Each structure stands twice: as C-alpha cells, then as structure tokens.
C-alpha cells in the first residue's frame, strides 16, 4: 500500500506496528524483508529493561565468561 | 585455571568459525578496495569524453584536421582531462588522510593494547581488557581482544560500614556483602567471601555520623592465640 | 560541547545546473560522468552522518530505566533526568539556545535517529550510569546504591573511601549547586554554544553561496 | 572529515568518561574526573564532567 513519512511516502510496503533492530534506513526513525514481503516499522531502540536498584541492594558476579572478539 | 584454557580455545574456535562461515564480515577493508577501485574505473571511464571536441581519442582528431584548427579541439579536450584528473587527486588526497587517521588508531591500539593491557574502556573490546593479538590483514589488520565478561550475578544486602566497639570499619579493597545472616567482604568483581578481620578492614571515627550502619563483630585474629 | 554530525544535504546535478530543459542536460552529457561523481561523494558522506550518530550514541545493549523512586543518597538528579511532561530540562535549554533550504536541486534529507530516540538514548546512557556505574559497560548491569558507587569513585582518584561517608552531605549540596549553575549559566549567558552553532552557520554559508552562484 | 574527526573524539569520551572512569589527566573536565552525564544536543552531544 502507501505508507507516508517525514522522509517521505513509501508505497510497496507494508506497515506494521511491533519493532525489531533495522536493516534498510529510511528515515525519521523507519527502517525496512519478512514473510514474503517489504515491512516497515519504527526502530526498535534496543531490549528493555529497569534494573532493581535500591539503597542497600549490591549484585556481584558468581561466575565469568572469558570472550574473544575481533576489530 | 582448567576452565579459563577451556574458555579461551572454544573462544578462539569459535571466532575462527564465525569468521569463516559469515561472508562480508571484513567489510571495513572490502570497502575501502571498492572506493579506491571505484575512483579509478570512473577515471579510466573519463577518456571517453568530448567535454565539446568533436572526437574523443586523440589520435583521430589530430590525424584529421590542420592544426590551427586541431589546436583549439586539443585545449578543450586537455582542459577537461586535466579538471577530470585534479578531481581524481583530490578524493584520493581525501581518502589518503582518513586512511591515516585509521592507521594511526590501529598504531595506538596495537601500542596499547598488545604491548600492554589498556585501562581504557571499550576502547579494546566489550569488557575488562586482558590482552589482545594482531593478526595480518589484506590491507590492513585484525586484532583478537581477549576480556572479561562477568556473569551470574547475584543479588546481596550492602553497608557502607560496620561499627564495632564504637568505631567505624570500612573495608581496604572490596564491599560488605551480606546474605542475609551474616556478613563478609567480598572483592567487588568476583564473590568470593571471607570473615571480616582487622586485617581487612580499617578503622576511622565513630560510628554515628555515616549513613547506613549495621552492627557486627569484627573478627580478631589477634585474639585466640593468646589463650 | 562537541559537534557529531551535519545536515544531509543531497543535490541533484542536472536540476542544479539545466532543471527542466533537455537541450542543456543534452550538452552536459558529454563532459561524461561528472555528476554521478558529485552525487556520489553527497551520497557518502550523507551516511556517514549516520554513522557517526550511531557510533556516538548507540552504544548501549539494552535500554535501562530509572527506578520510580529517587532516593540516591540526597544527590538530586531530577535537574538532568528526562521529564514525562515533554527530554530533561538541560536538553530544553540547548535546544531553544540554538538558532537553526528546500529551492531547486538543494534537499536535506532526515536523519535515521529522530530527536526523541537520540533522547532515549541518552536517557539510557545516565539512567545506567546512576544505578551500576561503568558495569553495564563490561557486562550485564549490577545494581549497586549510589552513595556506594561515589565512594568507589573516590577510591579510584587516591582518596580512601571514607571521605565520602563522613562528608555525604556536603558532598550532595556541592553536587547539587554545581548543576543549579550549570543550569543557570546555560539559561542566562548566551553564545556559549559556539562550537555547535559554527557548524550550521558554515553549512548555511555554503549553501547560500552555492544558490548565489546561479545568478 | 573534521565533522568525523569530533564524532570519533566524541565517541571515544562518551565510552571512556561515561562508561567508566577515565585516569587520563585533562581528558574529561578540569580536576580529578569522576563520573559524567551526557546531554543530548541539536547536532551534537554535550558532557557534564
Ligand atoms: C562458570 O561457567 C562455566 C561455563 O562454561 C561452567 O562450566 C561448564 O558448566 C557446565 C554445567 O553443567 C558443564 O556441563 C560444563 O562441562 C562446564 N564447562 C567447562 C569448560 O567447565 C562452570 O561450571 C561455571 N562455574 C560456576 C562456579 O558456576
Ligand atoms: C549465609 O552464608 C553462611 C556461610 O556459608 C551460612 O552459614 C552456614 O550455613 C550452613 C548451612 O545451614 C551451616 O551448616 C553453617 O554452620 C553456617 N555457618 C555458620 C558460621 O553459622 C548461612 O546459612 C547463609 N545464610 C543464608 C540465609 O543463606
Ligand atoms: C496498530 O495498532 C493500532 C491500535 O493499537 C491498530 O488500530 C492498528 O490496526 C494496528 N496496525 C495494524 C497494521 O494492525
Ligand atoms: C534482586 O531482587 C529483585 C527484587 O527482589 C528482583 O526483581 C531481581 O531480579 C533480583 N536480581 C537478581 C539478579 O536476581
Ligand atoms: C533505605 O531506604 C529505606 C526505605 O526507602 C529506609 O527505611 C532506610 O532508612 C534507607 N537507608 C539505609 C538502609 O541506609
Ligand atoms: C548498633 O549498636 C549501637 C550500640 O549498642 C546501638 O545504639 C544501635 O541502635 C545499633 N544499631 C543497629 C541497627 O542495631
Ligand atoms: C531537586 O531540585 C529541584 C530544584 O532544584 C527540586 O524542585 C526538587 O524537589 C529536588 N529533588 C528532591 C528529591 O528534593
């Protein structure tokens, strides 16, 4: 169908609502394949969450995982 | 010790498959070869241009025509190769500068983190910093930051202090933890309790002016000898 | 204060140079593929704006939120942590402070991160730093209670911990007239935002002249 | 590139002071660095050292 965006109007896609980490940038916070079709959605910001913080709550590590990562 | 060997080989296994399965995963190279190919290819593709002339190629326009009237054909078609060729230099003398800023960051971190072990974070992989190894490159270099990634953490009750016999104890390196019956001094990156002795331990003042006391008995390894 | 980006400007060739006629689009042809160059170099360094914003902010794994309660020793943060009326009030005062076209060929195209979602970033960004410190920077986030955090922060200058434990108090109040200042010095004194502003004066400078050219 | 220069310079303080705690004399505010905020601002970022 026609999606319209700050960046501009987007037809050939379809638009949904739930988001992912994005692989084609459009702009204004839309990225675009899935499910046989060109999707477009808002960027997922990254996973949530809210730490339990509190004024007398420290969390030490156990255990350790030792990783090698190029550059 | 055992665990550690075990962790890093199936770490440096795994980026070895990781690295060979996964295609374009050295884009960074790959991608200064295109641009440099690119800026050639489109200069090559600039000598079949008029830019005016009547001929492109040279020889057929200075095989076919007197000159004074070749002459002002051959400025045009010289004007516009030189402009083509100065624009060429100047994206490299672009490309060459940003190269070098990238050759002297590789410079810096293989200075400071091969040769070293850098306190500097995320600046040699996600995580605390062990060491690191160049590798060779194309044209350029990969480096396998080894760090440390903690995991499993849990949670635990915290004071500042703890005031025993009227003086406030605040531990040398590490935090008072407590798992809720009794209370030790972990260091703050690994759990790893101990008793809490005067020897881990320093005094300074009372134990009424600093928020978030907790009472406990601090452990004498002076004493039980005497007896 | 530091600059981390520009405006994407992309131009168009033959709407700059001809626009809507072929006979001049026709003679720019043979001077062969100048502007597919030009366009080309616009087109690069357009992303790399966004690479830049990518690599500046986007450094957080997941986004963190602050807990509900504010309760951090008697430090205030309230004067820099985001507001659920609009940003926090530090960001509002940039971003009135800073004085920020569209005619033939000449078009900006967006960025990829909108305002809000640089906002949530860095909302992330201090939220995480309030509530573990650098630890969600190695590996997952430790809670840990932040006069605790300042003390270990004081450990690490040469100054043993207990300096802060004795001292909390003073401690708060010095942090908390510090960033009252900060806010009042950005609220009242101008022309402190120079660095920011002399790149858009630039970018606007360059492209009133490059318009100028066509007359 | 001096656009890139700043954001790889502004990249590097905001992983070094904000992710952590920065030793390195004069890199992040006058004095003994301890912890800092980053700002979000119109075309840049800004730090509260
Ligand atoms: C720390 O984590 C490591 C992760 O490898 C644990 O090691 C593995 O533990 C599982 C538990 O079922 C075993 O099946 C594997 O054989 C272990 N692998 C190796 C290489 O040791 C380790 O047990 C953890 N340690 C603690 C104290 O939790
Ligand atoms: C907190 O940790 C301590 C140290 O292990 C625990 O104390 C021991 O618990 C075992 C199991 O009941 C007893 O057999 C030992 O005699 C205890 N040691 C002492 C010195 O009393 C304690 O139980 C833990 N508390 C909680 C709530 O898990
Ligand atoms: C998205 O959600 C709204 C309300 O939550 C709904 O009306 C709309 O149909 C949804 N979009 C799609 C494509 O289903
Ligand atoms: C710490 O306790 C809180 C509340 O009891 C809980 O939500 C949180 O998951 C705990 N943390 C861990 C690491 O288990
Ligand atoms: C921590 O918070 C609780 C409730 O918010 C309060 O009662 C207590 O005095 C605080 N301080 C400590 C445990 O040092
Ligand atoms: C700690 O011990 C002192 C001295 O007996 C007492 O006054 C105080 O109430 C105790 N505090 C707690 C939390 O038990
Ligand atoms: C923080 O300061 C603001 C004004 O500086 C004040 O309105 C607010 O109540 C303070 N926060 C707390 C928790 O006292």
Same mark, same amino acid.
């Given at each position: 169908?026609?999606?319209?965006?700050?960046?501009?109007?987007?037809?050939?896609?379809?638009?949904?609502?739930?988001?992912?980490?994005?692989?084609?940038?459009?702009?204004?916070?839309?990225?675009?394949?899935?499910?046989?079709?060109?999707?477009?959605?808002?960027?997922?910001?990254?996973?949530?969450?809210?730490?339990?913080?509190?004024?007398?709550?420290?969390?030490?590590?156990?255990?350790?995982?030792?990783?090698?990562?190029?550059? | 010790?055992?665990?550690?060997?075990?962790?890093?080989?199936?770490?440096?296994?795994?980026?070895?498959?990781?690295?060979?399965?996964?295609?374009?995963?050295?884009?960074?190279?790959?991608?200064?070869?295109?641009?440099?190919?690119?800026?050639?290819?489109?200069?090559?593709?600039?000598?079949?241009?008029?830019?005016?002339?009547?001929?492109?190629?040279?020889?057929?326009?200075?095989?076919?025509?007197?000159?004074?009237?070749?002459?002002?054909?051959?400025?045009?078609?010289?004007?516009?190769?030189?402009?083509?060729?100065?624009?060429?230099?100047?994206?490299?003398?672009?490309?060459?500068?940003?190269?070098?800023?990238?050759?002297?960051?590789?410079?810096?971190?293989?200075?400071?983190?091969?040769?070293?072990?850098?306190?500097?974070?995320?600046?040699?992989?996600?995580?605390?910093?062990?060491?690191?190894?160049?590798?060779?490159?194309?044209?350029?270099?990969?480096?396998?930051?080894?760090?440390?990634?903690?995991?499993?953490?849990?949670?635990?009750?915290?004071?500042?202090?703890?005031?025993?016999?009227?003086?406030?104890?605040?531990?040398?390196?590490?935090?008072?933890?407590?798992?809720?019956?009794?209370?030790?001094?972990?260091?703050?990156?690994?759990?790893?309790?101990? $008793? $809490?002795?005067?020897?881990?331990?320093?005094?300074?003042?009372?134990?009424?002016?600093?928020?978030?006391?907790?009472?406990?008995?601090?452990?004498?390894?002076?004493?039980?000898?005497?007896? | 204060?530091?600059?981390?980006?520009?405006?994407?400007?992309?131009?168009?060739?033959?709407?700059?140079?001809?626009?809507?006629?072929?006979?001049?689009?026709?003679?720019?042809?043979? #001077?062969?593929? +100048?502007?597919?160059?030009?366009?080309?170099?616009?087109?690069?360094?357009?992303?790399?704006?966004?690479?830049?914003?990518?690599?500046?902010?986007?450094?957080?794994?997941?986004?963190?939120?602050?807990?509900?309660?504010?309760? +951090?020793?008697?430090?205030?943060?309230?004067?820099?942590?985001?507001?659920?009326?609009?940003?926090?009030?530090?960001?509002?005062?940039? +971003?009135?402070?800073?004085?920020?076209?569209?005619?033939?060929?000449?078009?900006?195209?967006?960025?990829?991160?909108?305002?809000?979602?640089?906002?949530? #970033?860095?909302?992330?960004?201090?939220?995480?730093?309030?509530?573990?410190?650098?630890?969600?920077?190695?590996?997952?986030?430790?809670?840990?209670? +932040?006069?605790?955090?300042?003390?270990?922060?004081?450990?690490?200058?040469?100054?043993?911990?207990?300096?802060?434990?004795?001292?909390?108090?003073?401690?708060?109040?010095?942090?908390?007239?510090?960033?009252?200042?900060?806010?009042?010095?950005?609220?009242?004194?101008?022309?402190?935002?120079?660095?920011?502003?002399?790149?858009?004066?630039?970018?606007?400078?360059?492209?009133?002249?490059?318009?100028?050219?066509?007359?």
């Amino acid at each position: 169908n026609v999606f319209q965006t700050r960046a501009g109007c987007l037809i050939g896609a379809e638009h949904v609502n739930n988001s992912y980490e994005c692989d084609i940038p459009i702009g204004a916070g839309i990225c675009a394949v899935a499910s046989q079709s060109i999707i477009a959605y808002t960027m997922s910001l990254g996973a949530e969450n809210s730490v339990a913080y509190s004024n007398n709550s420290i969390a030490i590590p156990t255990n350790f995982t030792i990783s090698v990562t190029t550059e | 010790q055992k665990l550690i060997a075990n962790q890093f080989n199936s770490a440096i296994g795994k980026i070895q498959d990781s690295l060979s399965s996964t295609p374009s995963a050295l884009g960074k190279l790959q991608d200064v070869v295109n641009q440099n190919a690119q800026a050639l290819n489109t200069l090559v593709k600039q000598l079949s241009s008029n830019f005016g002339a009547i001929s492109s190629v040279l020889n057929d326009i200075l095989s076919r025509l007197d000159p004074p009237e070749a002459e002002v054909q051959i400025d045009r078609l010289i004007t516009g190769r030189l402009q083509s060729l100065q624009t060429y230099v100047t994206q490299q003398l672009i490309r060459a500068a940003e190269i070098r800023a990238s050759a002297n960051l590789a410079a810096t971190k293989m200075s400071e983190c091969v040769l070293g072990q850098s306190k500097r974070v995320d600046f040699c992989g996600k995580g605390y910093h062990l060491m690191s190894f160049p590798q060779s490159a194309p044209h350029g270099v990969v480096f396998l930051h080894v760090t440390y990634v903690p995991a499993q953490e849990k949670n635990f009750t915290t004071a500042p202090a703890i005031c025993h016999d009227g003086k406030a104890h605040f531990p040398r390196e590490g935090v008072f933890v407590s798992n809720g019956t009794h209370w030790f001094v972990t260091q703050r990156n690994f759990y790893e309790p101990q $008793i $809490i002795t005067t020897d881990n331990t320093f005094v300074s003042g009372n134990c009424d002016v600093v928020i978030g006391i907790v009472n406990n008995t601090v452990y004498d390894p002076l004493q039980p000898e005497l007896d | 204060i530091l600059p981390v980006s520009m405006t994407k400007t992309s131009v168009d060739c033959t709407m700059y140079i001809c626009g809507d006629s072929t006979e001049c689009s026709n003679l720019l042809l043979q #001077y062969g593929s +100048f502007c597919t160059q030009l366009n080309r170099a616009l087109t690069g360094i357009a992303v790399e704006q966004d690479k830049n914003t990518q690599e500046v902010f986007a450094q957080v794994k997941q986004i963190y939120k602050t807990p509900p309660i504010k309760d +951090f020793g008697g430090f205030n943060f309230s004067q820099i942590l985001p507001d659920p009326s609009k940003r926090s009030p530090i960001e509002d005062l940039l +971003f009135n402070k800073v004085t920020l076209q569209k005619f033939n060929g000449l078009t900006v195209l967006p960025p990829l991160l909108t305002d809000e979602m640089i906002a949530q #970033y860095t909302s992330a960004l201090l939220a995480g730093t309030i509530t573990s410190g650098w630890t969600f920077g190695a590996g997952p986030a430790l809670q840990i209670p +932040f006069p605790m955090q300042m003390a270990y922060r004081f450990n690490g200058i040469g100054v043993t911990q207990n300096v802060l434990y004795e001292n909390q108090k003073l401690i708060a109040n010095q942090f908390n007239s510090a960033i009252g200042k900060i806010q009042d010095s950005l609220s009242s004194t101008p022309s402190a935002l120079g660095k920011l502003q002399d790149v858009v004066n630039q970018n606007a400078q360059a492209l009133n002249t490059l318009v100028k050219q066509l007359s």
